[PDB]
């Protein structure tokens, strides 16, 4: 689901929609939320609500608009998971980064904006959060269970603003060898933080996921909110 009327334009001209929430107290910092492979769906709506309840505005752009605008898939439905994996395999990461950079620029000057912008992404969106952090588009970036970060480690020195990553120690998208590479690589730049939640796997911060772990979700979420609060006025 998206907010009707909201349109954002990327550098290459492509336009896309977004789900937006603004807090009752504004101006406020704005968090761009990078979706997972299911599009702007119920958990993205929950993420917008969670951030708005904490005093932020939030913008979750339709990153699948270059393939199938408005795609919003149910992670409990097997056929819709298959569709999500197929869209993910065809997803253009570089265009996704550019669409997030356009949503970040948009987020700097809306009626509710205080001018500061953060980014929070989940899985596909956590990989995109690291790429965006390597470009410097945002003030602060956060990735939950980003996939494939061990293949992007040459970008560690390019991160020049803080970026926080929450990883499950039982997430087999990030097996022991990958966890060691990321831990060693990220450790060279103090602007990066990566925490490992040893009793949690993938999607551990989504309440309806089979991977949900309330203690790890709560610790990671409070660390995300502590990390974003400097953006507040």
Curated annotation (Swiss-Prot):
SUPFAM superfamilies: alpha/beta-Hydrolases (SSF53474). It catalyses: 2-(5-oxo-2,5-dihydrofuran-2-ylidene)acetate + H2O = 4-oxohex-2-enedioate + H(+). The active site is at 123, 171, 202. It comes from the Bacteria. Disulfide bonds: none annotated. It is an enzyme of class 3 (hydrolase). GO terms for molecular function: carboxymethylenebutenolidase activity. Pathway: Aromatic compound metabolism; 3-chlorocatechol degradation. One of its GO terms (biological process) is catabolic process. Keywords: Aromatic hydrocarbons catabolism, Hydrolase, Plasmid, Serine esterase. Carboxymethylenebutenolidase is specific for dienelactone and has no activity toward enol-lactones. Monomer. Belongs to the dienelactone hydrolase family. This is Carboxymethylenebutenolidase. It comes from Pseudomonas putida. The gene is clcD.
């Amino acid at each position: 689901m998206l907010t009707e009327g909201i349109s954002i334009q990327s550098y290459d001209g492509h336009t896309f929609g977004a789900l937006v929430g603004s807090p009752a107290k504004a101006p406020a910092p704005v968090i761009v939320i990078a979706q997972d492979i299911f599009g702007v769906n119920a958990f993205m709506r929950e993420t917008v609500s969670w951030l708005v309840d904490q005093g932020y505005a939030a913008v979750c752009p339709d990153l699948y608009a270059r393939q199938a605008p408005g795609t919003a898939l149910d992670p409990q439905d097997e056929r819709q998971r298959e569709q999500a994996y197929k869209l993910w395999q065809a997803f253009d990461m570089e265009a996704g980064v550019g669409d997030l950079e356009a949503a970040i620029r948009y987020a700097r000057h809306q009626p509710y904006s205080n001018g500061k912008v953060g980014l929070v992404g989940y899985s596909l969106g956590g990989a995109l959060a690291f790429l965006v952090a390597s470009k410097g588009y945002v003030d602060r970036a956060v990735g939950y269970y980003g996939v494939g970060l061990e293949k992007q480690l040459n970008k560690v020195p390019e991160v020049k603003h803080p970026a926080l990553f929450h990883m499950g120690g039982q997430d087999h998208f990030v097996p022991a060898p990958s966890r060691q590479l990321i831990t060693e690589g990220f450790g060279a730049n103090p602007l990066l933080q990566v925490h490992w939640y040893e009793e949690a796997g993938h999607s551990f911060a989504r309440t309806g996921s089979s991977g949900y772990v309330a203690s790890a979700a709560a610790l990671a979420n409070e660390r995300t909110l502590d990390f974003l609060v400097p953006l507040q006025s």
